[PDB]
Short mmCIF file of C-alpha atoms and ligand atoms in Angstrom, two decimals:
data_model
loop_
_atom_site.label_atom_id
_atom_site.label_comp_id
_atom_site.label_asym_id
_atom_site.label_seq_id
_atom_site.Cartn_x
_atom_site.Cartn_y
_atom_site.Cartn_z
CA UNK N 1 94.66 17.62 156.57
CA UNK N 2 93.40 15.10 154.14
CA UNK N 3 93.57 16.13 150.59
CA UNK N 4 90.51 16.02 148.47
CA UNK N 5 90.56 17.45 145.01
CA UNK N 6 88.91 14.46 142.99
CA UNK N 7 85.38 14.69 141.85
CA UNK N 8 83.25 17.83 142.53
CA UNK N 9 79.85 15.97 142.85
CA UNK N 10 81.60 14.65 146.21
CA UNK N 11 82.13 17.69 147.93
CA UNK N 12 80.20 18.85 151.02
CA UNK N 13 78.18 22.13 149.83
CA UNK N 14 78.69 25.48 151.53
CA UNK N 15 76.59 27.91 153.20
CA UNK N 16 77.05 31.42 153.12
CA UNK N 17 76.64 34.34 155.70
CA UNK N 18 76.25 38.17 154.13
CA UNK N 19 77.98 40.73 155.88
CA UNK N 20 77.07 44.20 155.64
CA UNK N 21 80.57 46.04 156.86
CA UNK N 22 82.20 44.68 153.77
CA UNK N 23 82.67 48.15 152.22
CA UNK N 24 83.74 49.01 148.86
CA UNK N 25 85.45 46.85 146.24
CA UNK N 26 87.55 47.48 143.71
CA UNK N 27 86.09 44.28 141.55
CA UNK N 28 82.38 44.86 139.68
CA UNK N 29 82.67 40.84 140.46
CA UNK N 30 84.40 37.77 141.91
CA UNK N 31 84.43 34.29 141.81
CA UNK N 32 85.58 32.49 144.53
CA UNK N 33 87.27 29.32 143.52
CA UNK N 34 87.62 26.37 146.01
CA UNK N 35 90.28 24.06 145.34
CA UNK N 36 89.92 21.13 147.93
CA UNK N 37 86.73 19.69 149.82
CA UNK N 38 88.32 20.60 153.36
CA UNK N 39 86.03 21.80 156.51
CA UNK N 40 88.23 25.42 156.53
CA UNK N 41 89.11 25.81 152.95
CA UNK N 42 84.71 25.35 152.32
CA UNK N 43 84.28 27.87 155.36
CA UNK N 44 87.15 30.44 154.24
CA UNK N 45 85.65 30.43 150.83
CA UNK N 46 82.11 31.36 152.14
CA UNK N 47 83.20 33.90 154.31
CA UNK N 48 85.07 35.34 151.36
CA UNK N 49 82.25 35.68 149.59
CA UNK N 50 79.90 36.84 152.30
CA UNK N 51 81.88 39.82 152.32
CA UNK N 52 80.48 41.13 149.10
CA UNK N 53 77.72 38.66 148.46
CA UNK N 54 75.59 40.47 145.88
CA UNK N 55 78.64 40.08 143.53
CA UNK N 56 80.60 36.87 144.33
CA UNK N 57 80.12 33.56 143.04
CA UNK N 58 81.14 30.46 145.03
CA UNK N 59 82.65 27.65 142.48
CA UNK N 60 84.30 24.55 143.40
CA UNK N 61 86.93 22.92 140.61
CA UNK N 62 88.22 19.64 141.04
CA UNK N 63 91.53 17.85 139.46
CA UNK N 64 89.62 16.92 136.27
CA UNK N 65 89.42 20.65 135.77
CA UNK N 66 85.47 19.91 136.26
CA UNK N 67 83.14 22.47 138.71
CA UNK N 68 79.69 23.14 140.12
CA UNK N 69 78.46 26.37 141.54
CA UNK N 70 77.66 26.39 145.07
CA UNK N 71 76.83 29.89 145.97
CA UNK N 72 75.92 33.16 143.25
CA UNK N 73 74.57 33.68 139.90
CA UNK N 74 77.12 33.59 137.43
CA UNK N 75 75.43 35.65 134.75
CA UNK N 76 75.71 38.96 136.67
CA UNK N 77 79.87 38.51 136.05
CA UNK N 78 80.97 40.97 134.34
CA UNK N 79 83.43 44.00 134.48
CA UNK N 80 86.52 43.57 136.43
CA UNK N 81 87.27 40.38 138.03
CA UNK N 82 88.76 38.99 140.74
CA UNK N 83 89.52 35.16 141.45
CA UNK N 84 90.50 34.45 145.01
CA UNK N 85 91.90 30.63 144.88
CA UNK N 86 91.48 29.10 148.49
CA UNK N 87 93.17 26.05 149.37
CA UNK N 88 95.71 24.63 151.58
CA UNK N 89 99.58 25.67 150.91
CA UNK N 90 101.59 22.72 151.57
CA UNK N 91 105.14 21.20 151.34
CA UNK N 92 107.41 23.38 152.39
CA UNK N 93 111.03 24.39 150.42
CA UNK N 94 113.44 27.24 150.64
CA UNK N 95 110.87 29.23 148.86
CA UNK N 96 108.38 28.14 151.07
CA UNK N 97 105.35 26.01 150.21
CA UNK N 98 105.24 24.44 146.77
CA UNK N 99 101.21 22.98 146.50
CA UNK N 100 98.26 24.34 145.96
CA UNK N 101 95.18 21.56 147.12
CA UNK N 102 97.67 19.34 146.15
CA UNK N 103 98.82 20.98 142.60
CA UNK N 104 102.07 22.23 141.51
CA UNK N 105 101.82 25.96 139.94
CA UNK N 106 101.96 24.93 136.70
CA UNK N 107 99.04 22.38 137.21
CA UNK N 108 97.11 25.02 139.28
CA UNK N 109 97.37 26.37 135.88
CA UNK N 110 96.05 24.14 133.22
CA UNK N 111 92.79 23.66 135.43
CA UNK N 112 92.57 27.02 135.90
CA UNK N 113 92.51 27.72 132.27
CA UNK N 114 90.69 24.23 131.56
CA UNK N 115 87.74 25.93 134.15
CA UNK N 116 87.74 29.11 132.46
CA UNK N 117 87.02 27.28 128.97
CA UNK N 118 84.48 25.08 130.38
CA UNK N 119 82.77 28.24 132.16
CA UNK N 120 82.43 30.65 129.02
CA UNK N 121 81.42 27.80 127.32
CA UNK N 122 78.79 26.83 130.26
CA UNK N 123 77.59 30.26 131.18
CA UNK N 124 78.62 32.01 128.20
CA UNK N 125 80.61 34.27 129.82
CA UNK N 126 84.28 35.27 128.57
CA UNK N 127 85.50 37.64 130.95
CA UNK N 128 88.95 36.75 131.91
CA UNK N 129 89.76 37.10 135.34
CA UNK N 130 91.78 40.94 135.85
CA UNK N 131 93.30 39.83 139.54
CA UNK N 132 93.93 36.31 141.03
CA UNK N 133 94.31 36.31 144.76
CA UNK N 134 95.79 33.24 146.20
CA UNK N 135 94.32 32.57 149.25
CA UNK N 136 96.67 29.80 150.86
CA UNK N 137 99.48 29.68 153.06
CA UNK N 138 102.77 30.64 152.41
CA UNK N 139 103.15 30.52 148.95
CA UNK N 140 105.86 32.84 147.34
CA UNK N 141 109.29 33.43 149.01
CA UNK N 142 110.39 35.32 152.07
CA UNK N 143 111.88 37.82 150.06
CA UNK N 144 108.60 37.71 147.56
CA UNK N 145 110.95 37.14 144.66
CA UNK N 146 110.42 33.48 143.98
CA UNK N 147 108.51 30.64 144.83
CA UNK N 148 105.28 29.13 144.06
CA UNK N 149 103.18 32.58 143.14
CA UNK N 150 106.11 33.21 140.84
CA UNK N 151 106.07 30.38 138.69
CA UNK N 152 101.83 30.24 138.88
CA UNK N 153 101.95 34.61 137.31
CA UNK N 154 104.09 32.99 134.25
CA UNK N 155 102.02 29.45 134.14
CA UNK N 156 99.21 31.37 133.90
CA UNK N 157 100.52 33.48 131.21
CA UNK N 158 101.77 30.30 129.27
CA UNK N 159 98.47 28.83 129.82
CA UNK N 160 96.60 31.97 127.81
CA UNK N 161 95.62 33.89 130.91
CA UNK N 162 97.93 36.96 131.59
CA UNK N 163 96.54 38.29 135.12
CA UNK N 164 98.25 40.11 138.10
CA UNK N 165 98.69 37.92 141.46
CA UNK N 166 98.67 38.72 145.27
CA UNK N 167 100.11 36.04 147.40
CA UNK N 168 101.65 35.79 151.15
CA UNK N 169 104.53 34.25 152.33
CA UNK N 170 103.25 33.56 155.34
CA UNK N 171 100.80 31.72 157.30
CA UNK N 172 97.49 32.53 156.36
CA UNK N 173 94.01 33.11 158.31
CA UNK N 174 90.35 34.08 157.29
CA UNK N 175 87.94 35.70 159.45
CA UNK N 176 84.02 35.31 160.16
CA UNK N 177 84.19 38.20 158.19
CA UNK N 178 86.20 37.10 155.17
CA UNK N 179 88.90 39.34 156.05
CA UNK N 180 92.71 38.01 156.16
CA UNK N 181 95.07 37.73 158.81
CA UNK N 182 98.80 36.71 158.81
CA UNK N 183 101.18 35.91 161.03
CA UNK N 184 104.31 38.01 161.87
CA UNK N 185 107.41 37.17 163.05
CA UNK N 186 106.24 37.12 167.19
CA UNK N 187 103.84 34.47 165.66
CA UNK N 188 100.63 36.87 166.52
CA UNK N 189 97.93 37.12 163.67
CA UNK N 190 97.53 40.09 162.71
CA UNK N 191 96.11 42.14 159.67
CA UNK N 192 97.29 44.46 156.94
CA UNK N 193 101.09 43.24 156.82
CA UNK N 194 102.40 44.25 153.73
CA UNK N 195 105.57 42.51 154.62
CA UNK N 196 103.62 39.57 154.45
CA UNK N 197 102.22 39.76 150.95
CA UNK N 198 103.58 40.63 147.44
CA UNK N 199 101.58 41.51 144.64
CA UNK N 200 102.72 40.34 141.35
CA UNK N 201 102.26 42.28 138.11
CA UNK N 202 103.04 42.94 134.46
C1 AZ0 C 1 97.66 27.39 156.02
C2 AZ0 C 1 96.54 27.49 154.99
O1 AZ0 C 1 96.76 27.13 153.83
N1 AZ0 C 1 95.33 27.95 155.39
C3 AZ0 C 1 94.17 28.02 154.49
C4 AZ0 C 1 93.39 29.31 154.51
C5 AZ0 C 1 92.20 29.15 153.56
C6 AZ0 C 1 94.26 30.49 154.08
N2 AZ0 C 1 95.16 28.31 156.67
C7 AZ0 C 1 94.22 27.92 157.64
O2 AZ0 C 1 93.83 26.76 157.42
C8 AZ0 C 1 94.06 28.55 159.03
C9 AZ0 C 1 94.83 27.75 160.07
C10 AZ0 C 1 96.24 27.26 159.70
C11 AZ0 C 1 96.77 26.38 160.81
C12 AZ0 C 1 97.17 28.43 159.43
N3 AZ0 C 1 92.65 28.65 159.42
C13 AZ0 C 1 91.85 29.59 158.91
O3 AZ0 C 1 92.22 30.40 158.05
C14 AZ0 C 1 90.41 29.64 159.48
C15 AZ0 C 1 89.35 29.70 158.37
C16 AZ0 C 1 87.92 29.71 158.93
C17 AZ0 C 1 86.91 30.49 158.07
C18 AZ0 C 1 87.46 28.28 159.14
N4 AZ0 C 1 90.25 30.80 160.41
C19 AZ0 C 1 90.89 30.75 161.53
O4 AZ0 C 1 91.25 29.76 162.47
O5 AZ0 C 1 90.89 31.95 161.89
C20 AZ0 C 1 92.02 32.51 162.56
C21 AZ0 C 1 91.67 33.91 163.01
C22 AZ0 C 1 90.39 34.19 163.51
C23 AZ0 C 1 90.06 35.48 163.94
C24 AZ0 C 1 91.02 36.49 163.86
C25 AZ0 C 1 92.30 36.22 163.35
C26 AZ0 C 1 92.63 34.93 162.94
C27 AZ0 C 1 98.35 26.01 155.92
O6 AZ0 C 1 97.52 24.97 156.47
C28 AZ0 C 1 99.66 26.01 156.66
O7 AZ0 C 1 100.72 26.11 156.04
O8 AZ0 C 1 99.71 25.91 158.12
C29 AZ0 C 1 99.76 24.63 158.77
C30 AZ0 C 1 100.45 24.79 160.13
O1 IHP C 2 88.84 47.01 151.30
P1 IHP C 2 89.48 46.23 152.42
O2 IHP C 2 88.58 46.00 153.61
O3 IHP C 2 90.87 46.69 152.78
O4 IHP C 2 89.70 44.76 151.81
C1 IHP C 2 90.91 44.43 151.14
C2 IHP C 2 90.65 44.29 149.64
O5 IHP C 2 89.63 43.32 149.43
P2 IHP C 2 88.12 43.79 149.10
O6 IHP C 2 88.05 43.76 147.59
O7 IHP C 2 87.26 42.75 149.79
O8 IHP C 2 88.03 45.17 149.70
C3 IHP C 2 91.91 43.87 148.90
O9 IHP C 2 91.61 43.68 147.52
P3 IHP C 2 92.47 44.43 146.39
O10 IHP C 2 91.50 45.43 145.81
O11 IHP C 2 93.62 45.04 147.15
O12 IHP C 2 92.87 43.32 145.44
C4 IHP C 2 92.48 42.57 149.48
O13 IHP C 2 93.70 42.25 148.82
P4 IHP C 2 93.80 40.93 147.90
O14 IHP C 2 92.92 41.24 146.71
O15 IHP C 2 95.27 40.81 147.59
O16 IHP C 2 93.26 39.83 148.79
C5 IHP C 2 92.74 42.72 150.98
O17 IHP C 2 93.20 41.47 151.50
P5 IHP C 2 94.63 41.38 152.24
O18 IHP C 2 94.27 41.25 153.71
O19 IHP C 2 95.27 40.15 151.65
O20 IHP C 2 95.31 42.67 151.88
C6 IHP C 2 91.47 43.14 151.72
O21 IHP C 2 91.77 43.32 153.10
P6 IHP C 2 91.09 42.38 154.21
O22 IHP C 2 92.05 41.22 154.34
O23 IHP C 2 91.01 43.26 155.44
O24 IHP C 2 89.75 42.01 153.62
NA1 NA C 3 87.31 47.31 150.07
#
């Protein structure tokens, strides 16, 4: 897995399928944030959004805390929002993986927030995301109570953007569909594991 997170105007584009059994959503809209320029993370973010496509936006953000669209209109964001981060977890620890597409939870951070000031500022928009969704593998502890989506919730809060996080601490799987899998102990993928995720409030 070669890491790519430089430059934005170097990424491969996306193309996005619509689904019609993606059901109901919680989220008026999302914005689907791809964090590396990697065959799977580009594919896993499409699917994402094709789940809901009338309402998600594709972006992709780079390490200079620059981004493009590739997929949605960005205007129609508004109401509740989700962000679901995709990228590869990597470099594993104790509490399991400690990168993000290469960044450290508290850099995940400042381009995070550096995005969300170039965005309002772009597309005039200042709706702070409500719910980030981290979309990588592995990242919080076994026993959900530290690790990587643990010190991201209070970067994030440091950083001026106070949101709620769901992360796994497993491995980590999207379907055609954009739905997620993980992987249980037996090593079998399956879906719905709430052992497997933790969601992280205030
Ligand atoms: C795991 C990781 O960070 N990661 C990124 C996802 C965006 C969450 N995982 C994947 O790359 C995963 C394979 C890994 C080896 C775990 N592949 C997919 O999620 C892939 C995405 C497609 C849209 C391209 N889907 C996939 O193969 O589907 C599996 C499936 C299909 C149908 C039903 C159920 C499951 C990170 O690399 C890690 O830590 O693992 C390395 C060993
Ligand atoms: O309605 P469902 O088919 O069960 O889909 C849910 C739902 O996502 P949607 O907004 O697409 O419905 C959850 O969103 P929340 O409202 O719970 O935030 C999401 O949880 P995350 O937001 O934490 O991703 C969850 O994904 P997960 O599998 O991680 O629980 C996902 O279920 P699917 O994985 O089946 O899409
Ligand atoms: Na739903």
């Amino acid at each position: 897995k070669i890491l790519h997170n430089q430059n934005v105007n170097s990424w491969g584009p996306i193309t996005v399928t619509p689904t019609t059994d993606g059901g109901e959503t919680r989220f008026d809209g999302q914005i689907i944030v791809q964090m590396e320029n990697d065959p799977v993370v580009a594919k896993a973010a499409a699917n994402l959004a094709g789940k809901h496509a009338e309402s998600s936006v594709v972006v992709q953000l780079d390490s200079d805390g620059n981004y493009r669209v590739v997929y949605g209109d960005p205007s129609k964001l508004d109401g509740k929002l989700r962000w679901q981060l995709v990228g590869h977890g990597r470099d594993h620890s104790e509490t399991n993986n400690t990168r993000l597409s290469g960044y450290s939870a508290d850099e995940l951070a400042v381009k995070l927030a550096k995005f969300q000031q170039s965005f309002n500022q772009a597309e005039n928009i200042n709706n702070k995301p409500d719910h980030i969704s981290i979309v990588g593998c592995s990242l919080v502890s076994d026993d959900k109570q530290k690790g990587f989506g643990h010190q991201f919730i209070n970067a994030m809060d440091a950083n001026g953007l106070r949101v709620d996080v769901s992360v796994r601490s497993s491995e980590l799987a999207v379907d055609e569909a954009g739905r997620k899998h993980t992987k249980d102990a037996n090593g079998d993928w399956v879906q719905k594991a709430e052992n497997n995720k933790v969601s992280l409030s205030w």
